[PDB]
Coordinates of C-alpha atoms in Angstrom, one line a residue:
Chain H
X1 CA 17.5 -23.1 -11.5
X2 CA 17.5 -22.9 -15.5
X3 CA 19.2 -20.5 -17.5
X4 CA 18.5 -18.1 -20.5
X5 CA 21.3 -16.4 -22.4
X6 CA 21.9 -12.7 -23.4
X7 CA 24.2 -11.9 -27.0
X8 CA 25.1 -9.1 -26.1
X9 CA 25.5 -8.4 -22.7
X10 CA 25.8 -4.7 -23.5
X11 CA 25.0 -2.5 -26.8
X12 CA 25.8 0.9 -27.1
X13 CA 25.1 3.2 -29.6
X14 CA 24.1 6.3 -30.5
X15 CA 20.6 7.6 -32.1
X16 CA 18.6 6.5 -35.1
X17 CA 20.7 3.7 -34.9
X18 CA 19.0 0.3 -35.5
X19 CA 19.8 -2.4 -32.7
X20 CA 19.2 -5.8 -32.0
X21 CA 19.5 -8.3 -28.8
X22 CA 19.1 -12.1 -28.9
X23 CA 18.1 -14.9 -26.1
X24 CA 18.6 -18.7 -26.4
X25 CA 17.0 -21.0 -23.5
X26 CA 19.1 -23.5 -22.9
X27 CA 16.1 -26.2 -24.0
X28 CA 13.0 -25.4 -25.7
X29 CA 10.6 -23.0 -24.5
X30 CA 7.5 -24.6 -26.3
X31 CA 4.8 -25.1 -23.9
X32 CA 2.8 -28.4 -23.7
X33 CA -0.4 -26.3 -24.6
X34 CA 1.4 -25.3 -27.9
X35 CA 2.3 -21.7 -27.5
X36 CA 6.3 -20.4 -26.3
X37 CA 5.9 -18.4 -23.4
X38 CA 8.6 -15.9 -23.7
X39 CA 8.7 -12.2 -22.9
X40 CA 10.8 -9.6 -24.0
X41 CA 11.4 -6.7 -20.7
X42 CA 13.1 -3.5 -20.1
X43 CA 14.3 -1.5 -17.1
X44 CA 14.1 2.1 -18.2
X45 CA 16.6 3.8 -15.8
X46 CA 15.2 4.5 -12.1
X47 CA 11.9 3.0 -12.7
X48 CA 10.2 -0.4 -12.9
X49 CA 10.0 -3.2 -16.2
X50 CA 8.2 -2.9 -18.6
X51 CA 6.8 -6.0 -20.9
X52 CA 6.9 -5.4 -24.2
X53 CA 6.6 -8.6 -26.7
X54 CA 4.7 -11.9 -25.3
X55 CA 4.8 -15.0 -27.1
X56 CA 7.6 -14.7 -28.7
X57 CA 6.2 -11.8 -30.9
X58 CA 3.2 -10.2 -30.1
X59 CA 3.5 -6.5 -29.2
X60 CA 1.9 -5.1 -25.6
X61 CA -0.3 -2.1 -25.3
X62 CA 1.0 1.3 -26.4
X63 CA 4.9 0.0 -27.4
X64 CA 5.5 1.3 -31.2
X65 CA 5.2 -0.6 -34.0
X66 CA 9.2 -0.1 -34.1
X67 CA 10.0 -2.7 -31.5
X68 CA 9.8 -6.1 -33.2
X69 CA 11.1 -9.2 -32.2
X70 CA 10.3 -12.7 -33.7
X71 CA 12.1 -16.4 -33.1
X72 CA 11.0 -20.0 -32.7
X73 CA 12.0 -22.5 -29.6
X74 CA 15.0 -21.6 -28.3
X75 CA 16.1 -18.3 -30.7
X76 CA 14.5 -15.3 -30.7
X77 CA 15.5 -11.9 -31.3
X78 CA 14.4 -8.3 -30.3
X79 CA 14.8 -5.2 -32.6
X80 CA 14.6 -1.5 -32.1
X81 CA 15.3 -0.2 -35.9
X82 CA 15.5 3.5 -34.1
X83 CA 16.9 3.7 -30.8
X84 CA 15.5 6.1 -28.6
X85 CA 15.9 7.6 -25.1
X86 CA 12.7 5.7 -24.3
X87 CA 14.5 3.0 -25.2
X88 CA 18.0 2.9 -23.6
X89 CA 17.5 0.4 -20.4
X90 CA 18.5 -2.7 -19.7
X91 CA 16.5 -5.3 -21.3
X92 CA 15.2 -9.1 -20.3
X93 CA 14.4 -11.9 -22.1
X94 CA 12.5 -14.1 -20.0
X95 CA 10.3 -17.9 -19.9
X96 CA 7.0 -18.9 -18.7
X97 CA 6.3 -22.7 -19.7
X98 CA 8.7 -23.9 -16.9
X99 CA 9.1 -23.9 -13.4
X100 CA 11.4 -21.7 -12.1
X101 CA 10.5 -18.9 -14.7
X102 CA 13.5 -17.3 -15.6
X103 CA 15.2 -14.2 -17.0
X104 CA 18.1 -13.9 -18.6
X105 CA 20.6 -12.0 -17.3
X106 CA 20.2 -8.4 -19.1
X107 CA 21.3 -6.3 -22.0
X108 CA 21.9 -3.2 -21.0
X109 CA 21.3 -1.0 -24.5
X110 CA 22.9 2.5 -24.1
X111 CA 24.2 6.0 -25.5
X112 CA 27.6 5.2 -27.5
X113 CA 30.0 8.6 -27.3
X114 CA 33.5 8.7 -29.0
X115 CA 36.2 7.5 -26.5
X116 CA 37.9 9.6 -23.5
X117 CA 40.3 9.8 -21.4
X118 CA 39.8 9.7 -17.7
X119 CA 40.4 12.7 -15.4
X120 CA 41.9 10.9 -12.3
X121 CA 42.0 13.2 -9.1
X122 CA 43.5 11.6 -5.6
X123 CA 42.7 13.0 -2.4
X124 CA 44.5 11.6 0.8
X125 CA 43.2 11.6 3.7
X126 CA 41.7 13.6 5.5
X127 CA 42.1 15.6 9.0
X128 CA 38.8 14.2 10.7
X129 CA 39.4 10.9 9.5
X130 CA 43.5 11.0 11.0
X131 CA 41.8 11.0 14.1
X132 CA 38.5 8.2 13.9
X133 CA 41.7 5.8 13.7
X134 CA 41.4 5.7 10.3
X135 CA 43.3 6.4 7.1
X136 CA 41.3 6.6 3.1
X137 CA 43.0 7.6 -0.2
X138 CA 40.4 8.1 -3.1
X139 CA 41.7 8.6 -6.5
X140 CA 38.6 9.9 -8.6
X141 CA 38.8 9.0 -12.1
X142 CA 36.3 10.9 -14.1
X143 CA 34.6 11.0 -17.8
X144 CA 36.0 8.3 -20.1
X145 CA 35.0 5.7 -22.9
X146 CA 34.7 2.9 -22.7
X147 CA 34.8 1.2 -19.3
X148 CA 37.9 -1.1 -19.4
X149 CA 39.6 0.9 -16.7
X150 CA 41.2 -1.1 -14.4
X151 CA 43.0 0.1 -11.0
X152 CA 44.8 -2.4 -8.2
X153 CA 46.6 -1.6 -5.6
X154 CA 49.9 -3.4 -5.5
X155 CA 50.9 -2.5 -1.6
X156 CA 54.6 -3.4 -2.3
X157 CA 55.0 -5.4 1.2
X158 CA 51.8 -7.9 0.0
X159 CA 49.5 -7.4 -2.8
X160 CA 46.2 -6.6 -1.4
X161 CA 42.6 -7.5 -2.9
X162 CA 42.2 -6.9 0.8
X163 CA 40.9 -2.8 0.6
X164 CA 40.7 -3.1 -3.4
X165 CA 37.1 -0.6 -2.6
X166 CA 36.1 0.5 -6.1
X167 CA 32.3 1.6 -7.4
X168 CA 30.8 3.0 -10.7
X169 CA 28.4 5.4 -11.8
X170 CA 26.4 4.4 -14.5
X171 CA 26.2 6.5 -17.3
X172 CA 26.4 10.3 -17.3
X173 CA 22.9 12.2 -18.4
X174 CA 25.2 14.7 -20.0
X175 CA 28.2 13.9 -21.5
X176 CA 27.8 9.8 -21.6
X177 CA 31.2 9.9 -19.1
X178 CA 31.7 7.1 -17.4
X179 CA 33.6 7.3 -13.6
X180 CA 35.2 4.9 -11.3
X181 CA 35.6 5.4 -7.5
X182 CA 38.9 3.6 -6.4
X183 CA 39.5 3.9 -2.5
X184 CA 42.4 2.6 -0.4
X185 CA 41.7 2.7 3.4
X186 CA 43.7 1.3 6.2
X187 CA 44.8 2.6 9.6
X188 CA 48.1 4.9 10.1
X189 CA 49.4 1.3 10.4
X190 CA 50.6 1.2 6.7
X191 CA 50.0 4.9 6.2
X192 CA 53.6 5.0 7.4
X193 CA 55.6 1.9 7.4
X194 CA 55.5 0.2 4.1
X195 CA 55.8 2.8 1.0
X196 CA 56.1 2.5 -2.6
X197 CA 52.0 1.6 -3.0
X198 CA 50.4 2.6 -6.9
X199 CA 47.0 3.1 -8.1
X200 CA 47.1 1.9 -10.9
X201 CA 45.6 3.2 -14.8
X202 CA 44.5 1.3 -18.1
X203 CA 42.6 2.6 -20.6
X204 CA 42.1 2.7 -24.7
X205 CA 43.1 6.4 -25.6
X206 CA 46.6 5.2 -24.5
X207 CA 47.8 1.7 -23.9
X208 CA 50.3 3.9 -21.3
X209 CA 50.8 4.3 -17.3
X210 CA 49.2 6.8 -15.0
X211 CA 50.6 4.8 -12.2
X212 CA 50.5 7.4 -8.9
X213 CA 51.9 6.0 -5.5
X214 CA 52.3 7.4 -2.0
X215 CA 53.8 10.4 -0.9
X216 CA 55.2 9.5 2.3
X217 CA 58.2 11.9 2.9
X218 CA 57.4 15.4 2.0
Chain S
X1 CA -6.7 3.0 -13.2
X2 CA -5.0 -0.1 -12.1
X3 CA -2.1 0.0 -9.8
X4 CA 0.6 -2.3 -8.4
X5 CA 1.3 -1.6 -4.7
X6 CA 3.9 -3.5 -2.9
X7 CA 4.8 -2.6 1.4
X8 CA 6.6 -4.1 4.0
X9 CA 9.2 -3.5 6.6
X10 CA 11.8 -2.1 4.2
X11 CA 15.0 -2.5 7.2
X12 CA 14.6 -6.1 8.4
X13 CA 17.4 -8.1 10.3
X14 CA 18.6 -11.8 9.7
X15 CA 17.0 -14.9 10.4
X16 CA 13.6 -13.6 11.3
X17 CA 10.8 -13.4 8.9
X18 CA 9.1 -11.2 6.6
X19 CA 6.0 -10.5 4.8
X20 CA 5.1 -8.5 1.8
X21 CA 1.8 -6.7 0.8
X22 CA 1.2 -6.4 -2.3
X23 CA -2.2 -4.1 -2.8
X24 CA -4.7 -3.4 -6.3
X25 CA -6.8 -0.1 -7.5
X26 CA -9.3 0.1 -9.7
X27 CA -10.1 -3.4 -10.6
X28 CA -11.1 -6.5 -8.7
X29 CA -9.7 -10.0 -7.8
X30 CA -13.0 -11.9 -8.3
X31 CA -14.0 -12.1 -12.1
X32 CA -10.2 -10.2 -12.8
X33 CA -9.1 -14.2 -13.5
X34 CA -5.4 -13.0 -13.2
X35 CA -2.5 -14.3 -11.3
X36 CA 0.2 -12.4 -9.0
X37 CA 4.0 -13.1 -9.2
X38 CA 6.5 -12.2 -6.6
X39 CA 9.8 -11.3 -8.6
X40 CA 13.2 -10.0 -7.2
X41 CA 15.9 -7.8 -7.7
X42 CA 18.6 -7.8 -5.8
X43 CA 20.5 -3.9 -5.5
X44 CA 23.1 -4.9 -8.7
X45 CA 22.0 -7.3 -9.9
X46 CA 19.4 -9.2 -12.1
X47 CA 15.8 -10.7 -11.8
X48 CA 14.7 -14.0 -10.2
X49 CA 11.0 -15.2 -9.8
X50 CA 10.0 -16.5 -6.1
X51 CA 6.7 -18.0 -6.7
X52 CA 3.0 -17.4 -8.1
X53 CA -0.6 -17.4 -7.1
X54 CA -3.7 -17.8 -9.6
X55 CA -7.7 -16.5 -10.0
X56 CA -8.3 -19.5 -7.8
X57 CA -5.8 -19.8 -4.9
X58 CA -3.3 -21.6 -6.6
X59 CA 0.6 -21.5 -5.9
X60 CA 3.6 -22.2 -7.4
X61 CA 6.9 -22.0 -5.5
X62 CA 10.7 -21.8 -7.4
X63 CA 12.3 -25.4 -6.0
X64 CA 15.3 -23.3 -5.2
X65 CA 13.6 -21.6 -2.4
X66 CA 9.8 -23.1 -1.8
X67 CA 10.8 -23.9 1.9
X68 CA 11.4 -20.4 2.9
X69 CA 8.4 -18.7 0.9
X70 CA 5.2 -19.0 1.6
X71 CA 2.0 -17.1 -0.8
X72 CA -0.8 -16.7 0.1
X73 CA -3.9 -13.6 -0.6
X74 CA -7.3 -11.8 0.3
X75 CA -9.6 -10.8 -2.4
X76 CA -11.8 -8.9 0.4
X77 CA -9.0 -6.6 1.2
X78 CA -7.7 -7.2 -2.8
X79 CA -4.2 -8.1 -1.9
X80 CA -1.6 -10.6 -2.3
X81 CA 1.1 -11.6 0.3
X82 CA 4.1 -13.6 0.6
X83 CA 6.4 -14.9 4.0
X84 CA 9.9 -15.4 3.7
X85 CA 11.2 -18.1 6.6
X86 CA 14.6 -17.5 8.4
X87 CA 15.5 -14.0 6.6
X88 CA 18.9 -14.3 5.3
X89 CA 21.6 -11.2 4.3
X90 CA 20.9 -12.9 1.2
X91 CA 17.0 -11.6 0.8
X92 CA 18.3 -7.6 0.7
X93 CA 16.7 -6.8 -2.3
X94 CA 14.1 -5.1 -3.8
X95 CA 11.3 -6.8 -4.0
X96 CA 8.5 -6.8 -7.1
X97 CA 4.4 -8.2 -7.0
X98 CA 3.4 -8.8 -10.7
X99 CA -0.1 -9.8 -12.0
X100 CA -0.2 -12.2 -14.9
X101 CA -2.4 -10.9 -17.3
X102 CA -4.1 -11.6 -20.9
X103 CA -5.9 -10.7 -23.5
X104 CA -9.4 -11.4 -22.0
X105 CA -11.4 -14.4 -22.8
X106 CA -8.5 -15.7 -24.7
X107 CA -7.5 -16.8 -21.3
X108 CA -3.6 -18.4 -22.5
X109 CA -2.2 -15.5 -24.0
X110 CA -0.5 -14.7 -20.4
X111 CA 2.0 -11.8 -19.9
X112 CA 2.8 -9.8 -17.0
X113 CA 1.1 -6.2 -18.3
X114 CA 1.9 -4.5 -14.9
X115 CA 4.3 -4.8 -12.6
X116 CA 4.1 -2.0 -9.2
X117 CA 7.0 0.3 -8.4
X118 CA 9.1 -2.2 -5.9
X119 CA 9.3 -2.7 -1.6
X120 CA 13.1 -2.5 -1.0
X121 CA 14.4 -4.6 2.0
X122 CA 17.9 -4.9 3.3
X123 CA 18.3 -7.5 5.9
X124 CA 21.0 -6.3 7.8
X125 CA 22.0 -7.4 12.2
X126 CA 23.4 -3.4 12.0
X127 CA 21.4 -1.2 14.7
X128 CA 21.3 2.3 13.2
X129 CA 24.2 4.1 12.3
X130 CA 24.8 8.0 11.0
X131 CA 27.6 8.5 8.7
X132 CA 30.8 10.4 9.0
X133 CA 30.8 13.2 6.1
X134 CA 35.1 13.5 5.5
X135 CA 35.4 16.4 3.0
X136 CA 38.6 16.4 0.8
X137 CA 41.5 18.4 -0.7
X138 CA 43.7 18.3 -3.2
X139 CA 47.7 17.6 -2.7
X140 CA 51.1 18.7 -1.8
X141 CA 52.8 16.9 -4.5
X142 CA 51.0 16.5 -7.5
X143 CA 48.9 19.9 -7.5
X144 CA 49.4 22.2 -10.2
X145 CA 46.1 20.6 -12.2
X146 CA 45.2 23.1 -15.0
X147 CA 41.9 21.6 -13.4
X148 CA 40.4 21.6 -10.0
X149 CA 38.2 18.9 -8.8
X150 CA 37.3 18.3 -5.0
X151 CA 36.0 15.3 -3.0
X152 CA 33.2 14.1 -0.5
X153 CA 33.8 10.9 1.7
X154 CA 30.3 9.6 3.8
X155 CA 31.8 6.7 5.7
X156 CA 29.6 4.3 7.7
X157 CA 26.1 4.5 7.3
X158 CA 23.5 1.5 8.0
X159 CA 21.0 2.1 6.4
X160 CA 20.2 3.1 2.7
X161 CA 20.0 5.8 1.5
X162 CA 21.9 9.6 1.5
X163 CA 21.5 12.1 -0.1
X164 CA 24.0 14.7 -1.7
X165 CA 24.4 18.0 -3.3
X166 CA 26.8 20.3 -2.8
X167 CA 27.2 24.4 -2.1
X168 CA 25.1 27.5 -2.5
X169 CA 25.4 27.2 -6.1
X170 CA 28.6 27.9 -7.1
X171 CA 29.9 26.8 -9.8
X172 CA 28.7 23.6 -10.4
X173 CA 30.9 22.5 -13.5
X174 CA 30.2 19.1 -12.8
X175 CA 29.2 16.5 -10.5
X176 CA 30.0 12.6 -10.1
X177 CA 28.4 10.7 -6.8
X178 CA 29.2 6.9 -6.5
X179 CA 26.7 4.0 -5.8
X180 CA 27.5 2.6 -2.0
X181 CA 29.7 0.1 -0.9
X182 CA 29.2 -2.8 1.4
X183 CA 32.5 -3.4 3.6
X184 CA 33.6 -3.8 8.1
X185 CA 29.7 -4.7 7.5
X186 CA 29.0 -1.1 6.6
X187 CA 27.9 1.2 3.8
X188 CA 31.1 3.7 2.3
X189 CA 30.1 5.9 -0.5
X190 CA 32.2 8.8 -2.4
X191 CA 31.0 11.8 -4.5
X192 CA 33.1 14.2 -6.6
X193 CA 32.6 17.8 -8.3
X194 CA 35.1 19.2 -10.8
X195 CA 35.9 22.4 -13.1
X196 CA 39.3 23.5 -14.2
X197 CA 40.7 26.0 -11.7
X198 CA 38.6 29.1 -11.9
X199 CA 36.8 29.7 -8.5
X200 CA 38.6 27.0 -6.8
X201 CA 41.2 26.2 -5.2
X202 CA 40.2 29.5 -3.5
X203 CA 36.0 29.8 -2.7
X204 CA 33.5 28.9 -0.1
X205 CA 32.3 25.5 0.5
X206 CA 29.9 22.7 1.9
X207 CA 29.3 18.9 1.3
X208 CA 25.0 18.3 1.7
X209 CA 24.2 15.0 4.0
X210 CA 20.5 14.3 5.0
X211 CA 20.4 10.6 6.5
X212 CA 17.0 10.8 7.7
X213 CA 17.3 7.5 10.0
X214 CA 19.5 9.5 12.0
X215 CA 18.5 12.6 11.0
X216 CA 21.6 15.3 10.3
X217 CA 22.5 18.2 8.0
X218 CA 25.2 20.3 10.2
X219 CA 27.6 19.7 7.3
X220 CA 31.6 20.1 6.6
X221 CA 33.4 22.3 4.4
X222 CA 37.0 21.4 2.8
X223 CA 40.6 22.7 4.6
X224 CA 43.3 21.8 2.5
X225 CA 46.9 22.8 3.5
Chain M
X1 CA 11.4 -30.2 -11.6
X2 CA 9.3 -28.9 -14.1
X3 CA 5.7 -27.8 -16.2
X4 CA 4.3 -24.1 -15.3
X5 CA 0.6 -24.5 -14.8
X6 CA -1.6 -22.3 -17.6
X7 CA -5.5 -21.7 -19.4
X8 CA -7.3 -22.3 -22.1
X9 CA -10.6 -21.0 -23.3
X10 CA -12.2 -23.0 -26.4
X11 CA -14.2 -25.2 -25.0
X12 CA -12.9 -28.8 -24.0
X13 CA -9.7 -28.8 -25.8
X14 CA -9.9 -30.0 -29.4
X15 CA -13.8 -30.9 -30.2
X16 CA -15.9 -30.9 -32.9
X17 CA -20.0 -30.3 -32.9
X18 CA -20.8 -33.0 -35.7
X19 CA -22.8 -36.2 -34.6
X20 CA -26.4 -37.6 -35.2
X21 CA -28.5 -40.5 -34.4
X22 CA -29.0 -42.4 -37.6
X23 CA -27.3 -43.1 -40.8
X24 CA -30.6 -42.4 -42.5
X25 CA -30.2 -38.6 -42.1
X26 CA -26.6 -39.2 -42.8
X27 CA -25.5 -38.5 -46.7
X28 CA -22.6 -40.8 -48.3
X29 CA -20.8 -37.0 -48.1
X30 CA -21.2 -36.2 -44.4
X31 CA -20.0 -40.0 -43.7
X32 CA -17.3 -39.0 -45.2
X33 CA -17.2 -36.2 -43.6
X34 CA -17.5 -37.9 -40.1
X35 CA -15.0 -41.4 -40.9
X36 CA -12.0 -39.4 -42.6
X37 CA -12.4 -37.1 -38.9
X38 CA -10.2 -40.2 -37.7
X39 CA -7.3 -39.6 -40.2
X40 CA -7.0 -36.0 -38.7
X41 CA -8.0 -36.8 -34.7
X42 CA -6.9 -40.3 -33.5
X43 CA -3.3 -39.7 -34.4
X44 CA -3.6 -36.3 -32.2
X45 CA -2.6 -36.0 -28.5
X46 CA -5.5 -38.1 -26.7
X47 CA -7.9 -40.5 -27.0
X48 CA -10.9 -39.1 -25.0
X49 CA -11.4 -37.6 -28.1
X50 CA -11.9 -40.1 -30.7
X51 CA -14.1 -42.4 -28.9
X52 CA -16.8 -39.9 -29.6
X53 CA -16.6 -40.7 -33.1
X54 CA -15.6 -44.3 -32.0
X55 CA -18.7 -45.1 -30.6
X56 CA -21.2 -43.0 -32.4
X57 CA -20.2 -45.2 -35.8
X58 CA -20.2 -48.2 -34.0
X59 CA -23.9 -47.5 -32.8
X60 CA -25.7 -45.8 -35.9
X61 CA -24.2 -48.4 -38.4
X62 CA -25.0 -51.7 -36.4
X63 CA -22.3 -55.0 -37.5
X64 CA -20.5 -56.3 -38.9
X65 CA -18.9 -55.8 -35.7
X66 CA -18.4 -52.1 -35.6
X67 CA -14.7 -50.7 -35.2
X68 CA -13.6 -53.6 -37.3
X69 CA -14.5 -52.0 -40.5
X70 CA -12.8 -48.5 -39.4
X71 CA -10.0 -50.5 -38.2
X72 CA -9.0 -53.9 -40.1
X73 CA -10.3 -52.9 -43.4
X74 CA -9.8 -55.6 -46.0
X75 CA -6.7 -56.9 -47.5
X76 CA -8.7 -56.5 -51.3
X77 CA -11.5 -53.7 -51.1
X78 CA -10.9 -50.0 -50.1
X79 CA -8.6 -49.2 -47.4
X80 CA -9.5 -45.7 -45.8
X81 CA -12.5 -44.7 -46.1
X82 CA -15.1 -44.8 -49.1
X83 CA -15.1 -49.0 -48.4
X84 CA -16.4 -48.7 -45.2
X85 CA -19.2 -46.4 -46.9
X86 CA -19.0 -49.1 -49.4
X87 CA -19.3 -52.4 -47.4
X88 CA -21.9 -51.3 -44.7
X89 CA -24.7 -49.7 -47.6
X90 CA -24.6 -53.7 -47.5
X91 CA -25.6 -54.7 -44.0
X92 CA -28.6 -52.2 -43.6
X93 CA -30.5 -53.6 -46.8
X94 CA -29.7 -57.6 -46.6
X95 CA -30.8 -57.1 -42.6
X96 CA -34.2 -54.8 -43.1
X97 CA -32.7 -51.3 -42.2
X98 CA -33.0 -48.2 -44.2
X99 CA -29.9 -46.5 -46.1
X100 CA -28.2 -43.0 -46.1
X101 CA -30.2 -39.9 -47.7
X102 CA -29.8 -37.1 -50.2

């Protein structure tokens, strides 16, 4: 393989803001012919990429005079002096003088919001699931900033990154709310005889516990 | 008018083998002179570049791979292919064709102008499977929320994708679906809805599933305590 | 495990339309012209190049044995280029042959 290297891996802000990414290959990218192969990329979200710059700095058909981007042999930048919503993707430096050609690993520019805190919901389970052999707990977690949050689940008996099941939607086309989806699932083989269980907060409005548990005896 | 059209089996199973179409409009692969790349993406992840042909059938494999891929094309049917050997869980992807274009004449000023939409694969040994739609309540203990949000749980589904919306169009103060998860060799998947207590925890309900690989809609509707 | 294959499109690569037939419809000036074009090409990439050159001189201007004047000057004369202008308008008139032009 060979690798090229995102600074930073993700830049949020909000708009009219000037941004800026960066790309180093880790040895030159300056093709026996003469010229430095490199292409600047951009996943718009839901649809395809999306060249924008080649050689080093020359701008594609139709992309605005806004999104320069020069460098020379292994640096190289990109700029957006206004960021846009036709803007906001993730973005790909990439090579072309070597084989394998290879991207980076992708920037993924964003909306910035002021931070939140997370509206965590849990929901054991449920009557047709008591009954596949089967038990899930689902705390829901919704609409914070940034995405720090972190959630284990310390089964008391034996700590488990066995059924640690957690997912996350990418950013919300409304409020810019991030959410986690943290799911516990076992049989009602632990469902009743270990207790004490926790799923578990952290966030930056408050440096505090949320810490739930199970309910067992009720 | 030019177009980028990839196509294949989109639900393979493992070591087998593959092959991808990848199909042109309104231009042609004679005196085009461009090339066609076969680029990657795996569902979460990044990009990675599998091999490329050129104006004259010329091809040129990534080492880490080469073995397994195999690219080939027509210019009659104005199309470009590529075989990948022994299919592995690895391959689930979706998968890109991408011609390697210029600035005419100046024939070494190559980018890749257009790249098609994407053929998504998942390479799964997991015959067919519906899901199991588990519609959730809130609590016994810690349930006087000046809020109320509900849940959805669509548990064991091969393959991608659902769909879901929720109920004759309540109040919809909200809505927060999750991107699947792969576990038991299976695909688990959550979805939430939310407002602060005004029409729930009291009104009607329903949970939308489609699964057209299986092909059901007769839904479930939360029952709490 | 490495080099990804690419194109070109000015002609060969690095060439110059220049040479003649005969120093006679050469003048001092476009000998210049033509000798100095090995300071520039020569030290470049390749030499597939620079025996057009190579050879073209070493026909046209006849002894005393050719490269050796573009190559081991003189220890006391002109060292690159206006000596080997200089010291073959000598051959040409002491052995018959006609000179340069206008």
């Amino acid at each position: 393989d060979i690798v090229m290297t995102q600074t930073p891996l993700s830049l949020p802000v909000s708009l009219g803001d000037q941004a800026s990414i960066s790309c180093r290959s880790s040895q030159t990218i300056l093709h026996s012919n003469g010229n430095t192969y490199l292409e600047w990329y951009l996943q718009k979200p839901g649809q395809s990429p999306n060249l924008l710059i080649y050689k080093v700095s020359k701008r594609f058909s139709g992309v605005p005079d806004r999104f320069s981007g020069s460098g020379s042999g292994t640096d190289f930048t990109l700029k957006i002096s206004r960021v846009e919503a036709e803007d906001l993707g993730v973005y790909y430096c990439f090579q072309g003088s070597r084989v394998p050609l290879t991207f980076g690993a992708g920037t993924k520019l964003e909306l910035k919001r002021a931070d939140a805190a997370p509206t965590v919901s849990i929901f054991p389970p449920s009557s047709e699931q008591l009954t596949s052999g089967g038990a899930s707990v689902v705390c829901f977690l919704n609409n914070f900033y940034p995405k720090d949050i972190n959630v284990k689940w310390k089964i008391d008996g034996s700590e488990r990154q066995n059924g640690v099941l957690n997912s996350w939607t990418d950013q919300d086309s409304k409020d810019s709310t991030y959410s986690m989806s943290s799911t516990l699932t076992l049989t009602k083989d632990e469902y009743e005889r270990h207790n004490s269980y926790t799923c578990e907060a952290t966030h930056k409005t408050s440096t505090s516990p949320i810490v739930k548990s199970f309910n067992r005896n009720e | 008018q030019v177009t980028l059209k990839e196509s294949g089996p989109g639900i393979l199973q493992p070591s087998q083998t593959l092959s991808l179409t990848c199909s042109f409009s309104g231009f042609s692969l004679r005196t085009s002179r461009v090339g066609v790349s076969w680029i990657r993406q795996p569902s979460g992840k990044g990009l990675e570049w599998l091999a490329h042909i050129y104006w004259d059938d010329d091809k040129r494999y990534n080492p880490s791979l080469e073995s397994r891929l195999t690219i080939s094309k027509d210019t009659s049917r104005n199309q470009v292919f590529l075989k990948i050997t022994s299919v592995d869980t690895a391959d689930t992807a979706t998968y890109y064709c991408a011609r390697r274009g210029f600035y005419g004449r100046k024939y070494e000023v190559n980018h890749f102008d257009y790249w098609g939409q994407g053929t998504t694969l998942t390479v799964s040994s997991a015959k067919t499977t519906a899901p199991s739609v588990y519609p959730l309540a809130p609590v016994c203990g810690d349930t006087t929320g000046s809020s109320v949000t509900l849940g959805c749980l669509v548990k064991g589904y091969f393959p991608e994708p659902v769909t879901l919306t929720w109920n004759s169009g309540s109040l919809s103060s909200g809505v927060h679906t999750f991107p699947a998860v792969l576990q038991s060799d299976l695909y688990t998947l959550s979805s939430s809805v939310t407002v602060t207590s005004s029409t729930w925890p009291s009104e009607s309900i329903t949970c939308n599933v489609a699964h057209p690989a299986s092909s059901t809609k007769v839904d479930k509707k939360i029952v709490p305590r | 495990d490495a080099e990804f294959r690419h194109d070109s499109g000015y002609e060969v690569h690095h060439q110059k339309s220049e040479l003649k037939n005969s120093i006679s419809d050469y003048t001092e000036a476009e000998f210049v012209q033509l000798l100095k074009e090995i300071e520039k090409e020569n030290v470049a990439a390749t030499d597939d190049v620079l025996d057009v050159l190579l050879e073209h001189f070493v026909k046209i201007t006849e002894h005393p044995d050719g490269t050796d004047l573009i190559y081991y000057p003189s220890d006391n004369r002109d060292d690159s280029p206006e000596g080997i202008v200089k010291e073959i308008k000598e051959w040409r008139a002491a052995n018959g042959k006609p000179g340069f032009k206008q």
